[PDB]
Amino acid sequence: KVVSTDEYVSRTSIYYYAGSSRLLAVGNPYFSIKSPNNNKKVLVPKVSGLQYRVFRVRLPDPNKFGFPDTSFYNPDTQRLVWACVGLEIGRGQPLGVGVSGHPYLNKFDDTETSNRYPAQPGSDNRECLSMDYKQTQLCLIGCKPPTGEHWGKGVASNNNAAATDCPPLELFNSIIEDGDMVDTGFGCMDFGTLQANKSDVPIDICNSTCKYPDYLKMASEPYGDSLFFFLRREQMFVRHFFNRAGKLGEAVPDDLYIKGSGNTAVIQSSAFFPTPSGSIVTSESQLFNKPYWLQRAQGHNNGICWGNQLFVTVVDTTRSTNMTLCTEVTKEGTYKNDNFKEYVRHVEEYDLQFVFQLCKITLTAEIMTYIHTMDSNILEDWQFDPLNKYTFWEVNLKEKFSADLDQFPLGRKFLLQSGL
Amino acid sequence: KVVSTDEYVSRTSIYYYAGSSRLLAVGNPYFSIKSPNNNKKVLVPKVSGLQYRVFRVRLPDPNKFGFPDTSFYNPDTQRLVWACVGLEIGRGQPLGVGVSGHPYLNKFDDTETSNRYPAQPGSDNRECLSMDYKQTQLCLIGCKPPTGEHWGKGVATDCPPLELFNSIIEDGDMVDTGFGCMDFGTLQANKSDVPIDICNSTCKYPDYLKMASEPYGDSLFFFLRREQMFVRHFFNRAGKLGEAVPDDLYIKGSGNTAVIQSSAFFPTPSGSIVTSESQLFNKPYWLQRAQGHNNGICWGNQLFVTVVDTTRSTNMTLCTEVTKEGTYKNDNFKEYVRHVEEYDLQFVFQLCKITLTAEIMTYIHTMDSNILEDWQFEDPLNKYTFWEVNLKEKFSADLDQFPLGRKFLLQSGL
Amino acid sequence: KVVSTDEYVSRTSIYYYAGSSRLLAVGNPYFSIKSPNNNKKVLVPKVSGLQYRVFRVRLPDPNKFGFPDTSFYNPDTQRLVWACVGLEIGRGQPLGVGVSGHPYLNKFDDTETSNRYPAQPGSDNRECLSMDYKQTQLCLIGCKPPTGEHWGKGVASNAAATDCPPLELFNSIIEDGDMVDTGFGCMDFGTLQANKSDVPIDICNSTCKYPDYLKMASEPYGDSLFFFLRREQMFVRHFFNRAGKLGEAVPDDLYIKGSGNTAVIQSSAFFPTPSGSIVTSESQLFNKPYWLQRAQGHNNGICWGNQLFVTVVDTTRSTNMTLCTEVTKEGTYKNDNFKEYVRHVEEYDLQFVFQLCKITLTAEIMTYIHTMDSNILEDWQFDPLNKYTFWEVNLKEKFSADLDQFPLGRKFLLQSGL
Amino acid sequence: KVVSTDEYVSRTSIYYYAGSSRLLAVGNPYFSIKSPNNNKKVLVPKVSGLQYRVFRVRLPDPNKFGFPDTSFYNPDTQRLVWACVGLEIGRGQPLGVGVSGHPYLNKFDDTETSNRYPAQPGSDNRECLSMDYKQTQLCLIGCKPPTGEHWGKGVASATDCPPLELFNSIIEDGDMVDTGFGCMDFGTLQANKSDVPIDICNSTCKYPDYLKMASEPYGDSLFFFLRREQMFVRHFFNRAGKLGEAVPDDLYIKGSGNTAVIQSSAFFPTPSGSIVTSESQLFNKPYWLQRAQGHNNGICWGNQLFVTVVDTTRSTNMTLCTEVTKEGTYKNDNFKEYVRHVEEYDLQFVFQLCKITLTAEIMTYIHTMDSNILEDWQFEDPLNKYTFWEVNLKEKFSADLDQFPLGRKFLLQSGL
Ligand SMILES: [Mg+2]
Ligand SMILES: [Mg+2]
Ligand SMILES: [Mg+2]
Ligand SMILES: [Mg+2]
Ligand SMILES: [Mg+2]
Ligand SMILES: [Mg+2]
Ligand SMILES: [Mg+2]
Ligand SMILES: [Mg+2]
Ligand SMILES: [Mg+2]
Ligand SMILES: [Mg+2]
Ligand SMILES: [Mg+2]
Ligand SMILES: [Mg+2]
Ligand SMILES: [Mg+2]
Ligand SMILES: [Mg+2]
Ligand SMILES: [Mg+2]
Ligand SMILES: [Mg+2]
Ligand SMILES: [Mg+2]
Ligand SMILES: [Mg+2]
Ligand SMILES: [Mg+2]
Ligand SMILES: [Mg+2]
Ligand SMILES: [Mg+2]
Ligand SMILES: [Mg+2]
Ligand SMILES: [Mg+2]
Ligand SMILES: [Mg+2]
């Protein structure tokens, strides 16, 4: 049924470079700040190293592009499309690690070395704690937005009496949007719905959904439009061991321990949870600021940018430093806490660089039938929308294409790579 | 006496792809929840990153498969069998690490830096502690279920006699965690010396030496393994010391130091860091030349894929609000723990034919009398627990339509 | 339209070696000691392993240089320029790690494991703490000084919800003595942290700069980066929070309010301390030759204006030495009888191999060079950098044609087969 | 003078496989439990991951072996000997790390961050502490038992410090490897029995004398060896007891008042071997003994072979607990705690048959090298006083190499 694009897409010797120039995002890493009463107007966006960046790269329609000489194809019988053959994800700002926390984290005891009986809980024993998250680098490239997976609240059958009030778990797929949170060491789950107390994870995810890329689904899709290519590097270890306050929903069964007495009469909560740590960041392990040459994709789509668009998805927690800002409210000769206000800001700097190869397609009755079943919108647009409900970082390159490759960094690299 | 399958199994140019699609397991990482109607029925299974996953992969009988053209062999004199030539173990979910513990762990003192005399008094000094286990990745492939080794109570100091037991590793068996491959249920009577997810369980380690040395090599067509741990903390045990330190190894104390402290030490392990670069999975294995004599031949039209992967052992915190109120109160919330595992098994099989001469029939009959009987020329494994993966209806000849199929075609130049 | 220097710069077989000999800097790692009342009289300079070292390397003008035989070009139509083809940044002193701190660091609570309610009272809870910074090695070489990036206060200008300072990304020339980022970011701490206590004293009144690699790599002519190497690393050693008012409160949808003991919310103004971790010989970028054969940009090592800029950060020798003087000698130890000092030193040895080049100044090439930099033709007869601070390295009298008499020269001859 | 065995040992195309099958040791990692009846009889042996395992592998005498066809040599002028050309040290049990300790360790103060004045020990300040030792993997192969080095007390001969002497000895099965406290006779050099954990405090820890074994003329001790050691300092303590050598006065300014009584500078660290990983394993893989660095290229003179192993990467000690009295609530006195350690080995060999023509020149050469070779050939045993793990392969030699794991690996690797 499905065939490689190499069998019906003809490559030309025409190459073009396109660069986004510097892209900047500046905001609060823990939450967005709204303007009242407009609870829907964002004054300060949420900008965090733990966010997916999903760039929707717009390319100029090659069939309406002003080429100096169009004698390389026949518009009566052929249509043009761009193919991505080179990519470099520029990253500015120094390497660094940010931290996240909760002024009311649901941590009760430290359970690593000393947690003797008896335990005297109360009604509110939450603590103001912070941590450094799991480290993640990844880059996804395709002509279709990426698919994520996360656990959310499912539906339980009301037939039989519930042996547990644990919420039912369902694995959801969804498009990863720009700004979505990556998993941080506590799983890819909807914390807003599955953690009702709002205190079991830090505030930058406690009311969010953390998504993980569904690599298995995207790799098995027939046409392979999601993953032309990808890199990923994750790492974490357990930094600390705590337990939760609150009622233990599922009691330890009686065959797993001998009951205590006296000091040990009242069993402590075995609702354990670890804190993650991403450990060290290093230049040597960087995935970015280096060229990717998309020569042969594992899927059937070998870098063909159908619809004259492209999707670059990035996670990079190796520059997650959060800057401390401090203003002086009242100037005095001696230090007073109440004379200053503390703020936290995070920034992200990208510079997307591309090398595109012009391709032509001879529209025979057989190829037209193939492309129609693959995606009818391809032929319609060639003259031979539903993604607007999602949020992407728009990168318009319609006016950025240049045939002079050697005038740009990645272009020079491609010419040396290809022998041109 | 034993010969390579290459000498009597003839290979064809017929290849088939088969995949299980997404396989999900969801449950409680520490213990199963039983039905209120029948305490022997499991309602929420025990699902842990420290379990063996033993998939029993069922293949369609090629001698009864609906091939469009059968002119490539003669059923009057030959029989067919699949050979596994490629495998990829897909693993979903993010990398991560879970923890396990015990509300009444038998830890007495911390013996790392400061543990002066006299020793604390007590009849129950257990503590509520947790830890992160030794890290293990492994994959085993064969047409016979894997054999594990573990220590149990043997046959008869009052120390229990130790016996090394071999057994089939079943789906859901626990891997060793840093405290050894032993039957903790029978060898630790107090139920408090290891966390609750293994204190009433048996931890098994693969008996690689036994499996590699078997004549026909049905157990290990191929395997990979990566273990790691270090000692995170140093504790000692409460309870009477069964074997006192001999008098020639110390000068006796006196007064405050007269009552010797327990030298029943035990460490807590740690698996350290998990990293993408160390992953054994999500990559193709090409089973070209097995070290044993069975070069990937799936006798009985079945295949066993055994996996341990603790690098995705995250345990999710879930919390329900029993009573909604404007200020926080612990009694208004219930805390739960759940763990998930996501697999996607992908295979490439090669059709093979065997000419059943008097010499080959004799050889095979001695190897496994069931083979010829099932060929027309009660299953002893049904008492064991595996995760059956039924690929009877999943075989396809269009390799290039699937990820592993495309990798195989490039690898082999086809 | 920019073209490679290979297309209009002709290479000769003339090579010269030049070395700076030993370069030493000695001072206080945390601050300069100025004259009691005089501002521009520095008694002890600030010298730290966290400083950029930016060497402005002066070369002899080849058009005025006394070659033993000048019969290799035509002054009527050609001019000469040096090309850098070999470099080794010599580093003395042992590998080591220094620490920096603040006697009044704005650390309130340790938020790693135990930080229960209620919050401690007080108007000044600052503490005397130190830390070891993010580790950085880097070397940049070009004929133009490097460009840095850092965050500073932007236009005042979005005020009803927050009074946070406006942020703007500023580009500037990195000067000798500028501070590299340390784990708290590349920002102007002097203006953006008004309490002067949120970072150690060696950066709290300074601007930390990070090289703007992206800008320097995309400049049309490529004069900034003939070649560069970089190696950064850090992890989070500790977790603290800040004292002072929280400027942007946590939205109410991210938590359930406390009560009684937990009624007054603690500060979520968290901040980590960095650690550069281990330094090792095998990770060194220095004390090894770099052969500048083919640059990534269009300037393939051409030292226009007869100068060269070598920029270095090297925190792997950041040991700060303890010095103690005895004011009064007595038979028993008394703290008041001694004075404690801290000193840091840096030892460099810059080594170069240069290749003489000639340019035939045709009408086409003259037009190209004039558009590139009009000073080139004017200086040939065919300074806006003085407002900046650099470590001046004068090699005008250091050029030698006897390459095999010097370490890097022998390495060059062996490398090229000459 | 000394020449390679390649010059006078003729190689045949006859190969044989032999394996020990599973070898198991089970015991107490800290001490043996002696005769519950009488006499030096061990009921529970000392079995530790920090012990040397020295296997004395006995081969069948090829000059008396039942070869199906003996026309390949002439016993009137030739004798046969085995040469080792392949080995694999099988290791069972999971990777892991054990700990060792002392209920009365001579640790006084923690000297890492806070150790203020004044500080004087009482009469008994010992503590119940444990630690994880330096990590060591090593394997040595030869036809002669390995030589170890260790420090002991020298001759009696401004200080009362015991004289030190470097001793050489044969490493015996069960000997302790160095653990991070050095290769010394702790039994004689630490008279208080509390300065190191109980599993070495009355033992001698030996280190292989690589330099002595590599320089021996004939090279019988080390056909081949691998080693991997590692440790860091986990904690810093000092000792109680009188400091034998006071710090000289020129190295400090005296204290006064509460600092007038100087604290002991008898420091000592605790080691840690750090992480164990599969990727660092030396075992469970074949060694092809193709070209030895010494002159003996794998010739098993006397029809025996010595395989020495240290492997602390499976040093897990198992906890066992018996219930003396069953009750509905937990009580410490109702249970007894035990510690057990196990070791699992599977030694696999490929041997190549060799013949030696006994010319006048070779007989003289072999007689000077070792006269017993010719005597046993007919052309007591001083090693019986030592303790080795005996591995009898006399009945285990097989010519069907492809029926066994290492045989198949050897055939595939050699192109046979
Ligand atoms: Mg296109
Ligand atoms: Mg959801
Ligand atoms: Mg939500
Ligand atoms: Mg599992
Ligand atoms: Mg993955
Ligand atoms: Mg107890
Ligand atoms: Mg058992
Ligand atoms: Mg066994
Ligand atoms: Mg064997
Ligand atoms: Mg078989
Ligand atoms: Mg991994
Ligand atoms: Mg996970
Ligand atoms: Mg897992
Ligand atoms: Mg040096
Ligand atoms: Mg406090
Ligand atoms: Mg910029
Ligand atoms: Mg270094
Ligand atoms: Mg050098
Ligand atoms: Mg330095
Ligand atoms: Mg003095
Ligand atoms: Mg070695
Ligand atoms: Mg091994
Ligand atoms: Mg092996
Ligand atoms: Mg061991």
CSV table of C-alpha atoms in Angstrom, one decimal, chain D residues 112-293:
chain,number,residue,atom,x,y,z
D,112,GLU,CA,35.5,15.4,58.4
D,113,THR,CA,33.7,18.7,59.4
D,114,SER,CA,33.4,19.3,63.2
D,115,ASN,CA,35.8,18.0,65.9
D,116,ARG,CA,36.1,20.8,68.4
D,117,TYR,CA,38.2,20.9,71.6
D,118,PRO,CA,38.3,19.6,74.3
D,119,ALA,CA,38.3,15.9,73.4
D,120,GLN,CA,39.7,13.0,75.3
D,121,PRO,CA,38.7,9.3,75.0
D,122,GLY,CA,37.4,7.5,78.0
D,123,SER,CA,38.6,3.9,78.4
D,124,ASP,CA,36.4,2.3,75.8
D,125,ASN,CA,34.8,4.4,73.1
D,126,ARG,CA,34.5,1.7,70.4
D,127,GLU,CA,31.5,1.8,68.1
D,128,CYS,CA,29.4,-0.6,66.0
D,129,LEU,CA,30.1,0.5,62.5
D,130,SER,CA,30.2,-1.1,59.0
D,131,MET,CA,31.5,-0.2,55.6
D,132,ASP,CA,31.7,-1.4,52.0
D,133,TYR,CA,35.2,-2.3,50.9
D,134,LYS,CA,37.4,-1.4,48.0
D,135,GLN,CA,36.3,-3.2,44.8
D,136,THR,CA,38.5,-5.7,43.1
D,137,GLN,CA,38.3,-8.0,40.1
D,138,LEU,CA,41.3,-10.1,39.0
D,139,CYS,CA,42.2,-13.4,37.4
D,140,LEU,CA,45.6,-15.0,37.2
D,141,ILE,CA,46.5,-18.1,35.2
D,142,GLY,CA,49.6,-20.2,35.3
D,143,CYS,CA,51.0,-23.7,36.0
D,144,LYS,CA,52.5,-22.5,39.4
D,145,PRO,CA,50.6,-21.1,42.4
D,146,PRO,CA,50.5,-17.3,42.6
D,147,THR,CA,52.8,-15.2,44.8
D,148,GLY,CA,51.4,-12.6,47.1
D,149,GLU,CA,52.9,-9.7,49.1
D,150,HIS,CA,52.0,-8.4,52.5
D,151,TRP,CA,53.5,-6.4,55.3
D,152,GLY,CA,54.2,-8.2,58.6
D,153,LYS,CA,56.4,-7.7,61.7
D,154,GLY,CA,60.1,-7.6,61.1
D,155,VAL,CA,63.0,-8.5,63.4
D,156,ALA,CA,63.3,-6.8,66.8
D,157,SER,CA,66.5,-5.0,65.7
D,158,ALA,CA,63.3,6.9,69.5
D,159,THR,CA,60.1,4.9,68.7
D,160,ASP,CA,58.4,1.7,69.7
D,161,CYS,CA,56.6,1.3,66.4
D,162,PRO,CA,56.7,-2.4,65.3
D,163,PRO,CA,59.3,-3.0,62.5
D,164,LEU,CA,57.8,-3.7,59.1
D,165,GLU,CA,59.0,-6.3,56.7
D,166,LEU,CA,57.6,-7.1,53.2
D,167,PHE,CA,56.8,-10.9,53.0
D,168,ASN,CA,56.2,-13.0,50.0
D,169,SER,CA,54.0,-16.1,50.2
D,170,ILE,CA,51.8,-18.4,48.1
D,171,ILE,CA,48.3,-17.1,47.9
D,172,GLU,CA,46.0,-19.9,49.2
D,173,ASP,CA,42.3,-20.4,48.6
D,174,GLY,CA,40.4,-18.4,51.2
D,175,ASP,CA,43.1,-15.8,51.7
D,176,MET,CA,41.8,-12.3,52.0
D,177,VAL,CA,42.4,-9.6,49.4
D,178,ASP,CA,43.3,-6.1,50.5
D,179,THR,CA,40.2,-4.1,51.3
D,180,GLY,CA,41.3,-0.5,51.5
D,181,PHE,CA,43.4,-0.8,54.6
D,182,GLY,CA,46.5,-2.3,52.9
D,183,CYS,CA,48.1,-5.7,52.4
D,184,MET,CA,49.2,-6.4,56.0
D,185,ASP,CA,49.0,-9.0,58.7
D,186,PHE,CA,46.4,-7.3,60.8
D,187,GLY,CA,46.6,-10.1,63.4
D,188,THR,CA,50.2,-9.2,64.3
D,189,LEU,CA,50.4,-5.5,63.4
D,190,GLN,CA,47.1,-4.4,65.1
D,191,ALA,CA,47.2,-6.0,68.5
D,192,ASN,CA,43.9,-4.5,69.7
D,193,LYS,CA,41.7,-6.5,67.3
D,194,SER,CA,39.4,-3.4,66.8
D,195,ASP,CA,41.1,-1.2,64.2
D,196,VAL,CA,39.6,-3.0,61.1
D,197,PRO,CA,36.4,-5.1,60.6
D,198,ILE,CA,36.2,-8.6,62.1
D,199,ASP,CA,36.6,-10.4,58.7
D,200,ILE,CA,40.2,-9.1,58.4
D,201,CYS,CA,41.1,-8.1,61.9
D,202,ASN,CA,42.6,-11.5,62.6
D,203,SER,CA,43.7,-12.2,59.0
D,204,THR,CA,46.4,-11.4,56.5
D,205,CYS,CA,45.3,-9.4,53.5
D,206,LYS,CA,47.6,-10.2,50.5
D,207,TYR,CA,48.1,-8.3,47.2
D,208,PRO,CA,49.5,-10.2,44.2
D,209,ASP,CA,53.2,-9.6,43.7
D,210,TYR,CA,52.8,-8.8,40.0
D,211,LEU,CA,56.3,-7.4,39.7
D,212,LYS,CA,57.9,-10.6,41.2
D,213,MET,CA,55.8,-12.9,39.1
D,214,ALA,CA,56.3,-11.1,35.9
D,215,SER,CA,60.1,-11.1,36.3
D,216,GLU,CA,60.6,-14.8,37.0
D,217,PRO,CA,62.7,-16.3,34.2
D,218,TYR,CA,60.4,-19.1,33.0
D,219,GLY,CA,57.1,-17.2,33.4
D,220,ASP,CA,55.1,-20.1,34.9
D,221,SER,CA,53.1,-17.9,37.3
D,222,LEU,CA,51.3,-15.6,34.9
D,223,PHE,CA,50.3,-16.9,31.4
D,224,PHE,CA,47.7,-14.2,31.5
D,225,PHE,CA,46.1,-11.8,34.0
D,226,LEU,CA,43.4,-9.1,34.2
D,227,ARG,CA,42.8,-6.8,37.1
D,228,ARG,CA,40.4,-3.9,38.0
D,229,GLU,CA,40.6,-2.1,41.3
D,230,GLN,CA,38.8,1.0,42.6
D,231,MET,CA,38.0,2.9,45.7
D,232,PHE,CA,37.4,6.3,47.2
D,233,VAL,CA,37.4,7.6,50.8
D,234,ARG,CA,33.9,7.6,52.2
D,235,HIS,CA,34.5,8.8,55.8
D,236,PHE,CA,37.3,10.3,57.9
D,237,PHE,CA,37.8,9.1,61.5
D,238,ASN,CA,40.6,9.0,64.1
D,239,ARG,CA,41.7,6.3,66.6
D,240,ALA,CA,41.4,6.1,70.3
D,241,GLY,CA,44.4,5.0,72.2
D,242,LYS,CA,47.8,6.6,72.9
D,243,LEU,CA,49.4,8.3,69.9
D,244,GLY,CA,52.7,6.5,69.5
D,245,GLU,CA,54.5,9.3,67.6
D,246,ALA,CA,53.6,12.8,68.8
D,247,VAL,CA,53.3,15.6,66.2
D,248,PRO,CA,56.7,17.5,66.2
D,249,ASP,CA,56.6,21.0,67.7
D,250,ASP,CA,57.6,22.7,64.5
D,251,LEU,CA,54.3,21.8,62.8
D,252,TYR,CA,51.9,23.7,65.1
D,253,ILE,CA,51.6,26.4,67.7
D,254,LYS,CA,50.6,25.0,71.0
D,255,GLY,CA,47.0,25.4,72.3
D,256,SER,CA,46.0,26.6,75.8
D,257,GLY,CA,43.1,26.2,78.2
D,258,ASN,CA,40.5,23.8,76.6
D,259,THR,CA,42.8,23.4,73.6
D,260,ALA,CA,45.9,22.5,75.6
D,261,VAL,CA,45.4,18.7,75.3
D,262,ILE,CA,46.1,17.8,71.7
D,263,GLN,CA,43.7,15.5,70.0
D,264,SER,CA,45.0,12.3,68.2
D,265,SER,CA,46.1,12.7,64.6
D,266,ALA,CA,46.0,8.9,64.2
D,267,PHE,CA,43.5,9.3,61.3
D,268,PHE,CA,42.1,6.6,59.1
D,269,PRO,CA,39.6,6.6,56.2
D,270,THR,CA,36.9,4.2,55.5
D,271,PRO,CA,37.0,2.9,51.9
D,272,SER,CA,34.1,2.5,49.4
D,273,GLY,CA,34.3,0.5,46.2
D,274,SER,CA,31.5,2.6,44.5
D,275,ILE,CA,29.3,1.1,41.9
D,276,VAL,CA,29.4,-2.4,40.3
D,277,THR,CA,28.3,-2.6,36.7
D,278,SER,CA,27.9,-5.3,34.1
D,279,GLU,CA,30.0,-3.4,31.6
D,280,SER,CA,33.1,-3.6,33.9
D,281,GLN,CA,32.9,-7.4,34.3
D,282,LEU,CA,36.1,-9.4,33.7
D,283,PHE,CA,34.3,-12.7,33.9
D,284,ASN,CA,31.8,-14.7,31.9
D,285,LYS,CA,33.8,-14.2,28.7
D,286,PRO,CA,36.5,-16.3,26.9
D,287,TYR,CA,40.2,-15.5,27.2
D,288,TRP,CA,42.2,-16.8,24.2
D,289,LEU,CA,45.7,-17.6,25.5
D,290,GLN,CA,47.4,-17.1,22.1
D,291,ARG,CA,50.7,-15.4,22.9
D,292,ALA,CA,51.9,-15.0,26.5
D,293,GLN,CA,54.3,-12.2,27.4
